[PDB]
């Protein structure tokens with residue numbers, strides 16, 4: 001792989017190595033709130049993170065992933081639009097160089113400063129690598145970030161970033177509680193889509209919360225001190241690691257709320 005978010009390998013190039021980039025169910029999308037249909041058949045989301053076990057944080061050269069122990073049903077997502085049980089494997093964010101961009105999904109064309117993705121795989125497929133080969137393999141919970149008051153539950157993530165500045169670095173990251181990243185309301189929009197990074201597999205049920213979380217300017221500024229490059233290489237700040245909105249095509253976005 002050579003893709004990225006630089007001047008010559010960014011989203012508009014991905015289709016050359018990953019032709020599904022021009023597929024029928026690509027993500028992210030703009031959420032037209034006027035057009036999304038309230039679906040009284042959608043259930044409340046069940047986010048069950050009481051037993052979550054974080055293990056490690058990794059700079060993978062395109063974001064940082066907070067990884068979980070997904071060897072048992074500890075931290076699982078169910079309900080909502082989903083049939084069955086999805087196990088949390090990792091979360092990560094996408095963010096901008098400035099507060100006016102950074103999210104992947106947009107809401108009536110509004111871009112948020114960042115977007116959190118909590119990635120879960122369907123236990124009926126046994127492992128993540130098998131799940132991504134299935135149209136109902138993953139459930140990603142997406143949460144917008146706006147800049148205002150600090151998010152206290154994010155600070156532990158922020159403070160470890162200095163230790164994983166460059167691509168390939170990891171650090172122990174135990175005992176982190178992802179419930180501290182969840183807004184008050186679980187109202188959501190949902191639609192069928194894809195991973196937003198190569199290989200762009202069309203395996204995701206997206207669940208995008210309506211209510212953003214607030215983080216401070218100082219918190220997001222620290223995300224922007226990360227590097228895409230490896231240690232000692234020319235510094236390239238990890239900023240603008242978002243894919244823009246893709247064509248909705250023959251898809252409906254449904255709302256869980258009136």
Ligand SMILES: [Br-]
Pocket residue numbers: 011012244
């Ligand atoms: Br694009």
Ligand SMILES: [Br-]
Pocket residue numbers: 033
């Ligand atoms: Br709305």
Ligand SMILES: [Br-]
Pocket residue numbers: 037038039254
């Ligand atoms: Br509907």
Ligand SMILES: [Br-]
Pocket residue numbers: 119195
């Ligand atoms: Br992912």
Ligand SMILES: [Br-]
Pocket residue numbers: 117140195196197
């Ligand atoms: Br993603």
Ligand SMILES: [Br-]
Pocket residue numbers: 132199201
């Ligand atoms: Br993959």
Ligand SMILES: [Br-]
Pocket residue numbers: 185210211212
């Ligand atoms: Br709201």
Ligand SMILES: [Br-]
Pocket residue numbers: 151183184212213214
């Ligand atoms: Br909040």
Ligand SMILES: [Br-]
Pocket residue numbers: 161162222225
């Ligand atoms: Br820092």
Ligand SMILES: [Zn+2]
Pocket residue numbers: 092093094117196
């Ligand atoms: Zn993501």
